[PDB]
């Protein structure tokens, strides 16, 4: 056996505050979809595509300024081997049972020059299904490429259907394709949050927090979805519970899970586990940081070997953990 772990720490300065961050890789370069939504006298909302050039984020187009959208829209962005297609879909405040969705579509063959046109998913599949923004990429199901907008049910008391996606095979213009998710461990009185689809080598999987009723904390869950008949998927909970550590993010390298853990729910120290064998402790007190931690630690896969581990230990400061792994 030949393990080959290799980490290097770097920093990125962002002169633009971001309420939320969305990281993606394209053309082997790192980008962020920043939400600059400040709430003051002159402060307005902006959604920026931003590419890291050296040790600092460079602001490219603000995509949001085109959307007649009146507020905070859902961001489902997808990356392909030669393009990026993004969408800002509408929210469902109280009873915004808009029987049809209305998002925009943004397209680029360079991540800079972006072109837009408003799309309308009339009688959309995910009616009354709650949504949570994310980055993804094309999943292959039966020699067909699909971008997936996946959502979740609000509450559960009646046994069942409780998680579902709509799909596009025309770069996210048509969403008539219904993908079923059969996760049979949806207990009675549980609510799922921030559902993001982890996609790799045409294998479907989901990473989502769980708002515990007894506790008041959100616990990470990762499920592995198996394909049954055409467009039918049955999922199962992959266990990652670690003795005195909290589950955080999950990726794959060499076809092996590269998982993320914190010491406690406050995240003073984080640990990365390559196939549950080799660990690496990342000390967030780099760049002279007293008030530092690893809350919101995330993975940006760049290759079946590379993947970055990024978190923001303070405002306008990004800690880049440049991971490389080669088990052979």
């Amino acid at each position, epitope marked *: 056996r030949h393990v080959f772990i290799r980490t290097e720490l770097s920093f990125i300065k962002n*002169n*633009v505050p971001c309420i939320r961050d969305m990281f993606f890789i394209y053309k082997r370069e790192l980008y962020n979809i920043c939400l600059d939504d400040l709430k003051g006298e002159e402060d307005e909302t902006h959604i920026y595509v931003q590419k890291k*050039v*050296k040790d*600092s*984020w*460079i*602001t*490219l187009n*603000d995509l949001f300024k085109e959307t007649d959208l009146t507020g905070r829209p859902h961001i489902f962005a997808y990356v392909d081997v030669e393009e990026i297609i993004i969408l800002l879909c509408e929210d469902e405040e109280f009873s915004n049972r808009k029987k049809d969705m209305t998002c925009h579509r943004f397209y680029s063959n360079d991540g800079k020059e972006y072109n837009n046109a408003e799309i309308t998913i009339s009688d959309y599949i995910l009616k009354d299904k709650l949504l949570s923004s994310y980055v993804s990429l094309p999943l292959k199901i039966e020699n067909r490429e699909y971008f997936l907008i996946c959502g979740v049910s609000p509450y559960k008391f009646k046994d069942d259907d409780d998680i579902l996606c709509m799909a596009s095979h025309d770069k996210g213009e048509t969403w008539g394709t219904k993908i079923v998710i059969k996760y049979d461990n949806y207990k009675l009185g549980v609510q799922y949050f921030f559902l993001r689809p982890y996609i790799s080598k045409n294998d479907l999987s989901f990473h989502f927090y769980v708002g515990d009723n007894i506790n008041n904390v959100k616990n990470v869950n990762f499920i592995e979805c198996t394909h049954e008949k055409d467009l039918e998927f049955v999922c199962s909970n992959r266990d990652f519970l670690k003795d005195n550590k909290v589950l955080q993010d999950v990726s794959t390298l060499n076809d092996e899970y590269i998982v993320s853990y914190g010491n406690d729910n406050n995240f003073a120290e984080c640990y990365i586990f390559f196939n549950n064998e080799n660990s690496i402790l990342i000390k967030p007190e780099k760049y002279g940081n007293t008030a530092a931690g690893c809350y919101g630690g995330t993975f940006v896969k760049i290759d079946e070997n590379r993947a970055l581990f990024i978190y923001s230990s303070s405002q306008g400061i990004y800690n880049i953990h440049t991971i490389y792994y080669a088990n052979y």
Partner: antibody, heavy 125, light 100 residues
Framework: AVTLDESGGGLQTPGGTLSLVCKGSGFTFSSYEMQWVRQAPGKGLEWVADICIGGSYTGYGPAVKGRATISRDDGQSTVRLQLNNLRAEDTGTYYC??????????????????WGHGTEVIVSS | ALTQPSSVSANPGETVKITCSGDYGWYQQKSPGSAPVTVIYENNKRPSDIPSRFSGSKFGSTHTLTITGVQADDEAVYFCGSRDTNNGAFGAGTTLTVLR
């Protein structure tokens, strides 16, 4: 205290190349987007080329499409302007510009906050 | 093609409004050949070394440079700057002739 200085004037023959430079000072170059703007005799302002922070992105104007070439030398704090296949239309006073926002590269000519003195180029043999 | 009036004329002490309807940036140029100066560097942003009389406002896809109280040192050709379909371009130029 921002100062934008230009290279010496030109009078090159048509069909040839043109080289220009902007010696930037009084600010942090290699953190702001730089651009070129030409002005024809008695005519309006025409944007020629825009280069992003770290030379990541490049963009040229309609008249100089496929002929222009920009080059930001961060160590030297200078923006170069190459232009092959010189035409009569390329005669005029050229200026350099600096966007107002740091680490910002959106396409649009509403953010320039610094301008060079200008240098004359006359395309004639 | 940024629409901008060919010329505008107003007497001193009075307010002047220049429309560009083709975000918007206004740049003044006293004499053809002389380096232009940014009067307004965004819809509602003004550089430190620029008089308070100069102000800007954008409504829809039309911007208006308002010179509240005009003087003789404000005699210049003003240019708007923005983006048309995809590309970036400047206005035709509004020559400010002062009424005397």
């Amino acid at each position: 205290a921002v100062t934008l200085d230009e290279s010496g004037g030109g009078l090159q023959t048509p069909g040839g190349t043109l080289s220009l430079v902007c010696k930037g000072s009084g600010f942090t170059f290699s953190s702001y987007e730089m651009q070129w703007v030409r002005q024809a005799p008695g005519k309006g302002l025409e944007w020629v080329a825009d280069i992003c922070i770290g030379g990541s992105y490049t963009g040229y104007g309609p008249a100089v499409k496929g002929r222009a070439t920009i080059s930001r030398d961060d160590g030297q704090s200078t923006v170069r302007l190459q232009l092959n296949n010189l035409r009569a239309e390329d005669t005029g006073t050229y200026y350099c510009a600096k966007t107002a926002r740091s680490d910002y590269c959106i396409t649009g000519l509403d953010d320039i906050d610094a301008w060079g003195h200008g240098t004359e180029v006359i395309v004639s043999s | 093609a940024l629409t901008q009036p060919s010329s505008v004329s107003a007497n001193p002490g009075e307010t002047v409004k220049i429309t560009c309807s083709g975000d918007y940036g206004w740049y003044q140029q006293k004499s053809p050949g002389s380096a232009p100066v940014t009067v307004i560097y965004e819809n509602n942003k003004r550089p430190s070394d620029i008089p308070s009389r100069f102000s800007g406002s954008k409504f829809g896809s039309t911007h208006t440079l308002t010179i509240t109280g005009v003087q003789a040192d404000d005699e210049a050709v003003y240019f708007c700057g923005s983006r048309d379909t995809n590309n970036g371009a400047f206005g035709a130029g509004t020559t400010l002739t002062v009424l005397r």
